[PDB]
Amino acid sequence: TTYADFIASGRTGRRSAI
Amino acid sequence: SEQESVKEFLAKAKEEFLKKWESPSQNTAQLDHFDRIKTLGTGSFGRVMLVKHKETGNHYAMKILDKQKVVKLKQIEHTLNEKRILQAVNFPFLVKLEFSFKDNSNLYMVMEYVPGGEMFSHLRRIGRFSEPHARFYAAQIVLTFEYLHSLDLIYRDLKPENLLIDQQGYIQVTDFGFAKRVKGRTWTLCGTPEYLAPEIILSKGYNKAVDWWALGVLIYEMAAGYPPFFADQPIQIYEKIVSGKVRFPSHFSSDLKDLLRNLLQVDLTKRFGNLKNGVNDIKNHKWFATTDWIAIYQRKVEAPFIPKFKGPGDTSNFDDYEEEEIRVSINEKCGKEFTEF
């Protein structure tokens, strides 16, 4: 599922500005 | 008539803003007025600490920037923008700047403490928000961008990490590090990867339409539980953003999909918020038909939830962070660069 793929990704925590 | 009332609101709000924009406040407290308690959150350029004012006992959130690091990271003008804009604005959904000052080493912006935590934390924990709850939050951002854009301000860092939940369950936007007053177009590569509009990635000139694109990303993430363009590395995100393709969860309503495709238009000249009727194409969309805009502004709509509160100074709605000292040198650093702060 798309949800499962997001939750296993490296970008589920707080995101910083570039 | 209703439309004239809105025009009059915005005209008076611009008069009020311009007086403060042209004559900014400066040097309105000092460091030894406060006791420092703990770190509330971090960003690319510094940290925000819970502090307690010694005379009043009130708690505040103090953003601390190291002047030498700001210079090294080429953020001087952006930091001057942040403070000049924050001290001049006044809106229900913008955090209040209470004091600002500097010393030999650092710059300080003391805000009202918003105790309910980041929207981010609540969204990740619950998974996703229902459409009525996402709509409640979205309406506040629509009004906030109507206000900011009318003052020639672009915000440029919309994301759940910057949307704090207050004790009445409403939003306060924080972090104006990339906010800028501009008539016409600008070019800086800035923002957060998931939220960048195509025209930023493609190194085109751009305008306030980037904030309306970011609203589309925010509404999608609130209602889905994940962003519309995600990957493990930024470059793969950017490829998806520019492609013109977006897929929606099967549970999204017809009206939500229609609104989101209008906000997530890759051609800025076709994007909602940037057409002849401006913000009214959004406010009049079918997905917002049940929204009472004045009741939202006045904070009279029942909130989806009230954050838990265990007393003044409680930080339970925030993660814990490693603490670092605040050093102040005996010698002044970067005085000329930050004269106006």
Side-chain angles (χ1 to χ4, degrees), chain A, chain B residues 1 4-6 8-44 46 48-51 53-54 57-68 70-71 73 75-95 97-203 205-207 209-234 237-244 246 248-275 277-307 309 311-321 323 326 328-329 331-341:
Chain A
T1 68
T2 306
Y3 166 77
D5 292 336
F6 178 64
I7 293 297
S9 84
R11 299 184 63 88
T12 70
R14 294 172 76 256
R15 297 157 292 194
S16 304
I18 65 175
Chain B
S1 187
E4 284 301 316
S5 281
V6 173
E8 291 174 6
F9 168 84
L10 291 171
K12 175 61 62 169
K14 192 155 200 171
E15 177 185 84
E16 293 162 342
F17 167 83
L18 287 177
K19 282 180 264 136
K20 296 172 193 168
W21 171 257
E22 289 302 344
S23 300
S25 57
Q26 199 165 14
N27 194 42
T28 58
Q30 64 195 40
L31 189 60
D32 72 7
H33 289 170
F34 305 90
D35 286 306
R36 296 180 302 275
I37 307 303
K38 73 188 305 289
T39 296
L40 293 164
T42 59
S44 58
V48 179
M49 290 195 75
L50 182 70
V51 304
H53 189 254
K54 295 175 184 176
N58 295 329
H59 290 85
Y60 296 99
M62 188 172 69
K63 181 167 179 165
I64 308 173
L65 299 170
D66 182 314
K67 282 185 271 173
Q68 291 181 317
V70 170
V71 169
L73 296 174
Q75 297 299 309
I76 303 167
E77 195 74 23
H78 285 162
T79 299
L80 298 176
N81 289 339
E82 176 167 26
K83 177 262 173 169
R84 189 177 177 186
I85 295 167
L86 277 176
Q87 64 85 44
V89 294
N90 176 9
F91 203 65
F93 316 119
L94 297 176
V95 74
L97 182 67
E98 300 279 16
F99 315 97
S100 72
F101 55 94
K102 61 201 175 193
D103 64 22
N104 281 344
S105 296
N106 306 313
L107 310 174
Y108 306 89
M109 283 173 282
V110 182
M111 294 166 279
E112 174 182 332
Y113 172 44
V114 189
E118 302 165 7
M119 178 192 290
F120 179 91
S121 304
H122 300 284
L123 177 58
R124 290 287 181 276
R125 172 176 190 112
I126 201 66
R128 67 183 168 91
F129 298 156
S130 70
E131 293 192 29
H133 293 173
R135 179 155 49 236
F136 171 82
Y137 295 132
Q140 296 167 59
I141 305 306
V142 172
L143 292 175
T144 298
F145 286 170
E146 180 177 17
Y147 171 80
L148 292 174
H149 296 171
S150 80
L151 301 177
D152 312 294
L153 302 168
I154 321 183
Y155 175 62
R156 300 197 296 189
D157 204 18
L158 189 68
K159 54 186 177 189
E161 296 86 323
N162 288 345
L163 303 181
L164 311 182
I165 309 302
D166 72 22
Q167 199 59 69
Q168 293 74 44
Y170 282 76
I171 289 171
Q172 308 265 279
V173 179
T174 195
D175 194 349
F176 271 56
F178 296 141
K180 183 180 164 89
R181 196 171 184 239
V182 213
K183 289 174 194 150
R185 76 191 73 166
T186 197
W187 300 265
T188 301
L189 174 58
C190 61
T192 299
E194 286 79 349
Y195 283 78
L196 299 185
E199 58 270 28
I200 303 180
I201 291 157
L202 295 170
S203 299
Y206 65 84
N207 64 17
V210 306
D211 281 337
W212 296 120
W213 172 280
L215 177 66
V217 180
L218 181 72
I219 298 173
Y220 185 115
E221 186 177 325
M222 289 191 293
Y226 51 81
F229 316 105
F230 72 84
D232 285 326
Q233 299 297 333
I237 301 174
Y238 302 152
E239 296 175 339
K240 297 180 180 185
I241 290 168
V242 303
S243 74
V246 59
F248 298 106
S250 62
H251 62 79
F252 275 20
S253 70
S254 299
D255 291 336
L256 178 57
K257 295 189 291 283
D258 183 292
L259 174 64
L260 295 176
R261 285 208 188 86
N262 280 319
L263 293 169
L264 299 173
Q265 284 294 308
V266 296
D267 181 347
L268 64 93
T269 72
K270 295 185 177 176
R271 190 178 302 144
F272 267 27
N274 201 47
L275 309 179
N277 291 319
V279 69
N280 286 340
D281 288 330
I282 299 164
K283 291 171 80 180
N284 295 333
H285 189 276
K286 280 181 178 186
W287 195 71
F288 285 113
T290 66
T291 300
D292 181 338
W293 297 99
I294 302 173
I296 291 286
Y297 177 89
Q298 291 298 149
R299 304 159 62 94
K300 300 295 172 226
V301 178
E302 187 186 336
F305 79 102
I306 302 301
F309 182 84
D314 161 49
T315 67
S316 298
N317 295 311
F318 294 89
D319 285 350
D320 300 315
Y321 294 84
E323 304 291 350
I326 292 156
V328 182
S329 172
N331 299 284
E332 184 188 43
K333 313 298 184 180
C334 312
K336 181 69 175 176
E337 289 92 332
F338 297 101
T339 302
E340 76 174 46
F341 188 103

